[PDB]
Design a protein around this ligand. Sequence first.
Ligand code: HEM
Ligand code: HEM
Ligand SMILES: CC(C)(C)OC(=O)N[C@H](CSC[C@@H](Nc1ccccc1)C(=O)NCc1cccnc1)Cc1c[nH]c2ccccc12
Ligand SMILES: CC(C)(C)OC(=O)N[C@H](CSC[C@@H](Nc1ccccc1)C(=O)NCc1cccnc1)Cc1c[nH]c2ccccc12
Lengths: 456, 456
Amino acid sequence: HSHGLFKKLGIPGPTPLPFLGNILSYHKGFCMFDMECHKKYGKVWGFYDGQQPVLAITDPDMIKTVLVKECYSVFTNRRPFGPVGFMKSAISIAEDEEWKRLRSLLSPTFTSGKLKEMVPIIAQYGDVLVRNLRREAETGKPVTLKDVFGAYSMDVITSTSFGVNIDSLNNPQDPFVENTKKFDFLDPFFLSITVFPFLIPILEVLNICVFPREVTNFLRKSVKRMKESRLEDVDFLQLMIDSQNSHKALSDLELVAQSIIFIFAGYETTSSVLSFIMYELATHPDVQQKLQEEIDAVLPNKAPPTYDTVLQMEYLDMVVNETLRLFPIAMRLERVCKKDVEINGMFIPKGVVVMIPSYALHRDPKYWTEPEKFLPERFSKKNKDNIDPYIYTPFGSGPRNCIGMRFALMNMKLALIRVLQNFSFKPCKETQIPLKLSLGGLLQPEKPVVLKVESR
Amino acid sequence: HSHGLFKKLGIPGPTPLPFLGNILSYHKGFCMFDMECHKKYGKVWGFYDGQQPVLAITDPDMIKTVLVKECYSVFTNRRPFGPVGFMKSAISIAEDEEWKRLRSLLSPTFTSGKLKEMVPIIAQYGDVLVRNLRREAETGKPVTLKDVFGAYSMDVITSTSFGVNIDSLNNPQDPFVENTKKFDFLDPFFLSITVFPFLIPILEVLNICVFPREVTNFLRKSVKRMKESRLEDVDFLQLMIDSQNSHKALSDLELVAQSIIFIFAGYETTSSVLSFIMYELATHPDVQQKLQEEIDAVLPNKAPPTYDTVLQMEYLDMVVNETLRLFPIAMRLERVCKKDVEINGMFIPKGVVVMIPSYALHRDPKYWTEPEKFLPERFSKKNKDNIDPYIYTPFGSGPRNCIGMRFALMNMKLALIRVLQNFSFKPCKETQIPLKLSLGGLLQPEKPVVLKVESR
Ligand code: HEM
Ligand code: HEM
Ligand SMILES: CC(C)(C)OC(=O)N[C@H](CSC[C@@H](Nc1ccccc1)C(=O)NCc1cccnc1)Cc1c[nH]c2ccccc12
Ligand SMILES: CC(C)(C)OC(=O)N[C@H](CSC[C@@H](Nc1ccccc1)C(=O)NCc1cccnc1)Cc1c[nH]c2ccccc12
């Protein structure tokens, strides 16, 4: 029906089947399709997620236009997603003037000023991590990183965001811990979404929420207790409540929505990435040692890390940066074109979803040498300059980039510094080498990362 | 020529003489003209500063529209002022997109976060004040407040904004001190401006600057030394340099311009107001004692004040608030209407300067009882609620309000707490009672405030 679009424009792509579009091509997962598409077709191509035209662009002047130059005018929202229900107000979801309000009202949550105030707390759980890690290191049992990293990152969220302090590895079943741990695209549901996006309004009317209709009701209330327990008697909720004291302040259920996408991401990104990094440290043993040295020449005597010294560790930075090059958990960035528009000499008509294929661009040999080896020296202050910030985009770019970037980078670095101060990480046999990525829809490993840990 | 405007609109006012407009009416100073005009004419009137129509509005729904609701759309800039030269870029001066850039790029200079970081410094000079005050208190010589307060506030600026630490009362002639101390409306010049505003372009072409063409050249350079002396080896300049590291960063001479209007205001407002307050404490002896008690029940043993406890002193707040009611150093707020527009049912045509007569409204019996007595209980948490924030406007309102409000309130409170911890202030004979305001163009006293100081 609407499949003629790129045939007209003179824009190339894979021919789309009726109804499906090009979705059968995701049997290899988004990343492989993107990569293949980049090389078969070059710098611009089109496909159809159902009847939804998606235009993939790989020019960094053009990417800059979409992510930064013309964000407010044309390319302000991401792809409609559903059913959400009361999570329509979550910032990552919200659109246009509702977004801009929330982004403003939630921006100073992550300033150098407030990020630095959170450092002492994100400390006390790095220590909890060591002790939970040493019990697995004096008992030579290979360690599922995501698990031990998960509970750590989880401990950081509840703390950085509500107060609630839990040894979540130890209290894996505390009511605040169950809820919070709780399929995403490429699975039985969202493929149907993309083929039956007309069926989304069906469920919105049904209180059916992708976020299960129960985890929400736990934290909706648990907040308005906390709300009514410190009021009256440092974290994200606190920082959000003071802000509803221009625009229109912050409504009550809008607060619970932003908390949820804060609890995710702080959990699943931070812990997912720390395992990609630790897998990389194990499989490239020289880098781990180089880092363990710098960690120690800044913080001698296994010294506890601080704000200013974490930004002082450069090899630490380069390692994180390079792990994210190889695993940009986002994979793609996306904005809905809201007007007939022409950027850098190309007509983009209304409603086209515009897509930047991060994962593919991070592995493009046209910009990276040996792009699949793990080469942390790419990010040296010698070579960091020669890197197009519109090709390397692990946090997006522009006014709709990741709001948690600074906190995310600091969360993970405070982990590694503590964790590399006391242990070293060797591979095991059941350790997956080389790591295989999930054929699914998420930048996650086929098999969880298991490594051997050793006390120093 | 253009004097028919309010005669048409059906808007009332004093009939304007040719060329002059209504300026001869300023022989009683703006405030008295505003007050008289409010009572002769009511809620809306017009006059002509030369050929410049000025519409004075006293309705707080309408004031809110002009200062907050429609700031960005219609009422975004203040009255053209000149000649300025390179001070065209100073934020208080700049217009529209240049302003909004600078206001954004200079906003997080004054956050709770950064304001709190400045508290320890604004301390060490409160102490310098005591010792400079005790030399005048063990030597019973009546004290010119503006002088001792001036050097204090001056000490705070150079410190809060560059580093340079001077005992300016002691070093009254240090090169950084002379410059920085350096007629404003109602004097031989600006009256000619308002009658010959066509002659402003004349001087702009002449490097003639109201800011003398020399003080600027001192600080322009003194900065690019400091710029090139900490780079590389907490204050306003530092906070401004890190910010040029969306929009278009911060250009180099734009930095010097914002520094100048920072050095003023931090000097002349802070010290001007502290003398209005201390004059008031002397002439109303009961309030001074009430305050000296609360200052001591928060900070016992002449304890040094801190951030959180300054916001804890409520009678301190009420006193400042009420002094500003009686002396709003601004007197008037103003915005240039940039479109034919209709707010709250009144046509305002392009180019009309829109004026809110703060001083008059703070003394309006229609909103204030005994509005001229000094009654600090007006601002009690019992009665503070019954106060239209669009009548009481010592810092303006809305997106173009005073950016230094929080710092100003905290600067002055840290002064009074220290100064009232060690001294009490009695009037003298040559002390002007009742204070007379300058017939001139500035909210300043006819005669400087002299009081008797006594050690405790
Ligand atoms: C390694 C950690 C993380 C990575 C790689 C990451 C990556 C991203 C990316 C690529 C985007 C979209 C950028 C764009 O569209 O241009 C994004 C958005 C976002 N991220 Fe993160 N993120 C991380 C962690 C976090 C954390 C800890 C938070 C904390 C709450 C957070 C909050 C958000 C939000 C709210 C958005 C939506 C931005 C918006 O739509 O306004 N992220 N993230
Ligand atoms: C008792 C102290 C002060 C009072 C009563 C005061 C009052 C005001 C008022 C009424 C305005 C205009 C508001 C409006 O147009 O709606 C203003 C503007 C401004 N004030 Fe203050 N002010 C004070 C101190 C300061 C201080 C210490 C600074 C520090 C640098 C400062 C910086 C500014 C700036 C930059 C503007 C221009 C705002 C703009 O045009 O964007 N002020 N002040
Ligand atoms: C942004 C549109 C409207 C197109 O659809 C999405 O909302 N997005 C998708 C689906 S639900 C996003 C939500 N997830 C979440 C999942 C379970 C429980 C609670 C929340 C979210 O905001 N998590 C924050 C986050 C995650 C990763 C990195 N940083 C921040 C997922 C998504 C993939 N990458 C993103 C980048 C930004 C925003 C969303 C996503
Ligand atoms: C705002 C327009 C463009 C209409 O003309 C002015 O720029 N304004 C007038 C004249 S020069 C403003 C400048 N003074 C200054 C004087 C000598 C040396 C350096 C700077 C300024 O910005 N000082 C900051 C300030 C002063 C008082 C309270 N807070 C902040 C003066 C003026 C009276 N009340 C204001 C309120 C806001 C901005 C300016 C003024």
